[PDB]
Structure formats: C-alpha cells, structure tokens
Amino acid sequence: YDFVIDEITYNFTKEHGTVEVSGLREFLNPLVVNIPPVVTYKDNKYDVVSIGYAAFQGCRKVTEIKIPSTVREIGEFAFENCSKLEIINIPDSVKMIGRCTFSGCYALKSILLPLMLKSIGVEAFKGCDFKEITIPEGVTVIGDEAFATCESLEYVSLPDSMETLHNGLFSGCGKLKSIKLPRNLKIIRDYCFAECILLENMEFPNSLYYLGDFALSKTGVKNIIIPDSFTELGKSVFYGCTDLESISIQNNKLRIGGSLFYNCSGLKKVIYGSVIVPEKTFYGCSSLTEVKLLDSVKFIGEEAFESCTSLVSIDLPYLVEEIGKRSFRGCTSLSNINFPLSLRKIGANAFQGCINLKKVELPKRLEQYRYDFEDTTKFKWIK
Template identity: 30%
Template sequence: MKSKKIISGLLALSLVFGGAVVPSAVIGNSVISASASSICDDSLFISYGGNHAVDFTSEDNHYSYYIFKDGTVYLFEIQGLYDDTGEWHKYDEEMVMPSEIDGKAVTCIGYAAVGTNSIVKKITVPEGITMIDNGAFQSSYSLESIDLPDTVTYIGDYAFECDEKLKSFKIPPKVTTINNLTFMGCKSLTSVSIPDGVTSIGDYAFEYCESLPSVNIPDSVTSIGDGCFYGCVNLRSIVIPASVTSISKNAFVKDEYYENNEIKYRPLKNLTIYCYKGSYAEEYAKANGLKYCLLDQGFVYKQLDDNTIEIIKYVGNDTEVNIPSKIDNIPVTSIHSAAFYGSNTIKSVVIPDSVVSLGDAVFGGCTNLENVSLSNNVRSIGQVVFSGCSSLKEIVIPDSVTSIDSAAFLDCIGLEKVYLSNNLETIGASAFNGCKSLKEIVIPDSVISIESAAFVNCTGLESVTIPKNVVSIGEYAFAVCDNLTIYCYTNSAAQQYAIDNEIKYERIDASKPFVPTYPTNIKVDHSEQYHQVRFTWDKVENAEKYGIAVYLAGKWRIQTQNITGTIYTTPKNLTPGKTYKVAIAAKVNGQWDVNNAIKNAVTVTVK
C-alpha cells in the first residue's frame, strides 16, 4: 500500500517538478502553455534515497508531501481515510487545510492537492501558508467559497480553474500577480477583490467568468493579458487606472468566428471601460470600438451641453470623499442619480458649492456614511437621496433648498439632528420615514406643506414645532410617533391635525406673560470635522430678521443682519481652540434690541 502511494507521489512529482512534456490549452486561436511546473524545483527539497515523497497519517486524514530544506512542507495530495463503516472517505463538504503535518509547518499547497471532485463546498487555508501552486484547487466543481490568509504571496496558474460554483474571491494583499487561467471557467463568480500591489493580470485569467458584473483594477496594475476577460458576457463595467500601459488586443472579447478563412472577434458589447483622460486604456477603448467613460480622482464624469461637468458615478474606495468643484477647469454642477449608491466604504462627503443639482438616490444605501457637507447652492434634496444611510447622524440642509422630495432620508435610523433650510417650502412624502433616532424637529416658517407619512415611524420623536404657515399636513405624517408632542399655534393646521389624530399638543401662543424681543434658549453645536459652530434659538415673535455680532478687539462687530430663520452656521475652518463671544439680536417692529442681545451673549470655543 505504502509503496503504491510513493509511486503515486513520484508520478505527481514528475508532473510538478519533472521535465516531462507539458500539455497546452488551446483557447480560440491562442495557445497557452498549461505549465504543470511548480514554482519549486527538486533542489529545494530534502531527498530520501532519491525520493522526495513522504506519507503521513493523522487521526483525520492521510497526506502525501515533500519537505523543503527549511523544514517546512509542500502538501501535494490529500488522500483520505477509511471511515468507521470501512468506506474510503476522502473529502467532506467543508475542508480545513492543515497548518502542520507531523510537526512540520505547511507553507505550500501543491499542484492538484485537492483533486477533481464535486463534494467540497468550502475550503479554509490557515495562516502560515505562503504559496498556492499551479492547479492546487482546480476542478473543485462544488466549491462555493475559499478563505485564504494574508500570508499567501503567490497563486499559481489555473489554481481555481473550473471551480464552477465559486461565488466571490478576495485576493490576499501580498499577492503581486494574477497568473494565467487562474479563475478560468469560474462561471458563478460575481465579485473579485484585487488588492493594491498586484502588478499584472495574466492571459485568460478570468476567461468564461460568465456571472462577473464588474471589476475594479487597482493603481498598481500595469498590464492586462491576452483574453483576460474572454467570454465574460455579463461584464458591465471595469475600472482601469492610468498605471496600465499594456492591454492585449483580445482582453475583452465575447467570442470568435470565422470569416473568409480568418478568425475574427466579437467584443463584449455591454462593457463600459472607466478610464482616465489621455490614458492607455482610453486609447485602447477607442481603437477597439469599446464604450468608455472618463474618470477623475475616482469620479466618472461627462461634459454637458452647457459646458459644465456632471459626476456620473464614483468608483473609488476612499473613506473621505471630496467632490471636486472643477474637472479640467470646467465647473462640476450636478451629480447624477445613484452616483454613489451602495458605496459602503465612504464615511464622509464634502459637496462643493459649485453643485446645484443632486439626482435621485445619489447616496442611497451608503450604510457607513456618517458626515455630509452639502453645497450651499443645491436647490432640492431629491427622492431617496440618503435613503438607507443608517450611520448618518446629522444633516444641515442649506437655505438654498426649497424642497425635500419623497423618501429623501428614508430609514436613516441613526439620524439624530436635522437642521432644515430657512427657505424650505415642502417636506415630501416619507421624507424622514423610519428615522428612529430623531428626537426633535423644528419646521421653519417658510414651510407650507408636510406631505403624507413624512415622519412616520420616527419612534424616538418627542417634539415637533410647526409654524402657522403650514396649511397642509398629509395623512400619517406623524403616525407611529407614540411619544410625540406637537407645538403649534391656535387654530392652525397643525393643531387640527393633532386633534384629528389624537396626538398630544401644546399651543405656542396659549399664554404670553412675557414676550422677549431678543433670542432666547440659544443652543450651540460644534462640528469638529469642519471646525464650524452652529447657533439655534427660539423664534422671537414678530421678528423681521436676526443679526450676529462677535466681540473682537474690544468692539462688537456685526457679521450679518439678514438671517430670516433661527439657525446660523459659521463658515468652515475656524481656528480650533479659539474662543469667541457672540451676540444674537432680533429686529422687531423695525427696531434692533441690541442691549438685551449683548446681555445674553454666549461664549464659544471652536473645536
């Protein structure tokens, strides 16, 4: 028995290390050497009387392996054992590769270590493995997932060839080359993560990965091999960085056919190449009749007829995103629908003041988005723009905005504070539906309509102040807000809504023993990210406008006198640690009550 195993091991050795004739794979009109040679050769191993193979039986398996001269193991065959019933048992649905055999550390999974099978569904490779040799896991027809450790530095040719049910793959960060045929025939592969550090993608590396919809190639890659994405019929988008200086002619081919005794190729007609202006990829796309869109800093964009730029899509992976105000010296004025949809790496976004238009669902499903600085010139918040942004805690809607469209903040379950535009007129249907962390909302005087279900399921909402000017409140606007008190005016639409829906309410104008002519209940919020300070205060009855003054160099200096609402946000990037004394005055019946404003001044320190 043992002698047969050693012979079997030597036969495998002749394939892996020997000098036998190596077969070739014929693909289309191309021939690729399906080299069965390992990255290792005989000189690296300890010899036992001219043989290298060693057999070892543990409690749960029988292995054949070679020993490197450094004492570590090259595992080339998992043979299995007889089970309790006497049946030969080689594979289970879940396989954990050994980290050591007979006290020796395993560092390399060898050629065809896991032989052709339709049993194994999951493989775990332990820390310490550094090499996955050619064909190590090929033809594991039922394999759905494999976990490789960060210690892996090399993955060989056709390592996962014809693993037809493999769904996703994360290439370890130390791997520098995706070799020939690595994922050939992985028909179910829908995602592959390529790390920075990979410099080349080999010939036919992803051939016939028929379910693969998109690929993001990192900046480290310089070459894409022949037939790399041959037959990837559902590939819709690929990001190619400016670092790529070589793409083989048939890299993006659907199939081939004969015409007049010549082989011709049909391109992947649904593919769009995202590339940089003036890059090799742009020229390649033009020369081969492929669709392409231009990139800048990870932003896909197009120039509009009015000589402005629209951001179409974001394909970067930064956590902090600053949208440029200009691309090629042309102003960026709009962001297309769903441009950032589902970008879960993003934590903060700054939108420049050049942007006036946000399309629907721009940031929908960005579950890790925490901070957004909106353009001060954006006109409306479109449908489902921030829907599902569950990590978003605060939003300041600038005074340029006049409408918030339906479901704009749907299911922003972490949203705690909302500062509405002082020129807002309409709050759309389901605009804040499911914002369960929202406790208080002050509707500005400019609003005239709150549409149906606008704040439905805001289960944490305790206080909402609704001005006289609101004349329409839709059905279920505040449904399932069980702890809510509505603060409203006598005979207003808000009071009637509260009565009709049996919601607790208090009339703001019920009794007025004292009517101040200066702002009271001044609150201060700080933004450490943008080094800003925001002031809010209670509305002063009959106030025409408000003003802000700061005490500098022994004098009160007016900053603005044209505030129409009860919110003021300082400019960004104030000096952290600097302390200011700030007075907020109201103009009532044509008079500024400066004295009381100064008496009630607040002191703030920039964070």
C-alpha cells in the first residue's frame, strides 16, 4: 500500500487527486470497516473513488463494510472469502460487479444491487447466503456460476430481456423451489440448475429452444413435457432427478444427447417420439413401468433401457430398425416385447439378464441374435 488512515490502507490511482482502498491495517502478530469518501495525506485531499482488486480478499473477521457514495468501481475479488461479512452496501454509481467479488461470503444474507448496474461477473456471488435477489433490468450479462452454491436462495428476479443463462448460474441452489424465466429466453447453458434439488416450478417460454448438458440434473421436477419449441437438448439434462415421475418428448425432429434420464429412479411413465432413443437415455430407471414409443421412433440406442428392472411390457413401433448393444440388459421383469419385421439388427447382449423373457417371436432371418437373449428364452421362428 501507499499509506494508511485509521484502519484502512490506500493506493494512489491515475486520476488526479484520487485513491483506491487497497486493504485493511494488518497486525503481523463485530468488526466494522467504515470507508471515508475523502482522506488527507501530507496536506492534500484525495477522493476515495474505488475499491482495489482483491482489497479485502480473505478478511475473514470483517462483519460490516460501509462504502461511501464516492466509490464508483469495485475490483475483482474485492471481498472474496470474507466469510463473516454480513452487512455491505453497493453505491449507486457502481456499474459492474466483477469476477469473484463476493465469492465465499457465506455469512452475507442480503444485498441490494444498484439500479443502473450493467454486469455481474463469473462467480460474483458464489456461496453467498442470500434468501432473495433482484437483478436490475439493465443488467445485460451474468457470468458463469454467479449464484452457484447460494444454498439459502429462494427467490431470484432475472432481467426480463436476458436471452441466455450462463453455465452453472444457479448450480447447487438447493432451496430454490421456483424461478420465473425471462420472457424471451433462448438458451439455458450447461449445469445451469444442476443440484437445485427443490426446483419444481419453472415454465418454459415459447422462445426457449436449448437446454445444455446437465442443465436440470438433480432437480425437483415431477412431470416434464418438452414442447415442440425445443430444438436441442444436450446430454444428461435430467441426470439423476429422483422426483421425476413422467416425461413426454413427442417431437419427431428434436435433437437429443445421450443419458437424458440416466438414474431417474422415480420415473414411472414415458411418452417418446424422437427418431432415435440415444444411448443410455433411460439407464437405471428402475421404477419405469410404462413406455409409449411413437411410430416416429426407429432406433433404440445402446444401453437405452439397461437396468429398467420394473419394466414388464414394451410395444416396439412398426418401423423400428435397430436395437442397440445392451439396450434391455438387466430388465429383470421384461416379459412382453414384440419384434417388428422392420428390425434389421439386435446389438450384443441386448437382452442379457432378461430372465423373465420366456417367449418371443422372431423371423428366422434374425436367428443369429438368439445368443443375445438368456438361454431360457424360447423362440418361435417366422419363415
């Protein structure tokens, strides 16, 4: 630092007659930091116009910081890991909250953002203990993981003009039950709501066409309908959702990654119409008991229904061409399945472990696939 006044250290900044707060007085061997708007040093007055980069980083004993109206800029990391910080104000002139500014402020239970704020950086509020936050209408960017691990957050108002939610924005917000999405939202990026285990109420705007990888993983959703307005779902979007009971994805042209409902162990009912059921879509869906595949479904991917141990019947629609490797492996309850004459290929061990699959009917043309069933399965061969 350049000089110290009371408990606070200062650095000279380029603008004539100005200083930045650079930290607190430290001894080598409830705490309120009261930042003044003006300090005098060696007969000259200096306006306190900014808080420096990492100025209070790791100051784990501070409980309150009072920031004067003259502060117009706050550096990245400024209050990072201020884990006892409970009380702080952001002056009206501050336009950006930078990277990690409040990351790790686990005791911070509220904040009011300046109405003229324009951007919120990566991880800006990661771990803060807010119950609610309102984002001013003019905020045009909110960075990755800005509210990740905000474990008390129950209410958030996003700017209504926002069109993209960044990666991991609300990852780990395990008290968030609802969110109102911006009315013209286009894209939800990867991990956005991952581990929002209580999240139940979220309506999709008509404009929303993309959900990224793991975007709704380990959420609280109960019944999902993917409307025709979606054009792409990433991988693992609903991975591990334990409260999800039904899904409907009927659109024949929707692009979908693998593992969408992997480990959705509460999923009971499926309606599915996309042309391909990708790899591992329903892996480990051990409560799944009703599966409606629309006539538009033509391929059942590798391991798609592996470990669906409650599924007794499935009607394969009349134009199915391929069943993948291990597609019904370990479906212990599976008893009733048809093999349409459009079928060209059955993958290795597709019906391994299907111990209750006692009788099937196949064309002689597919008899080489008999080894992909349990040796107890009896076959009726169609000439």
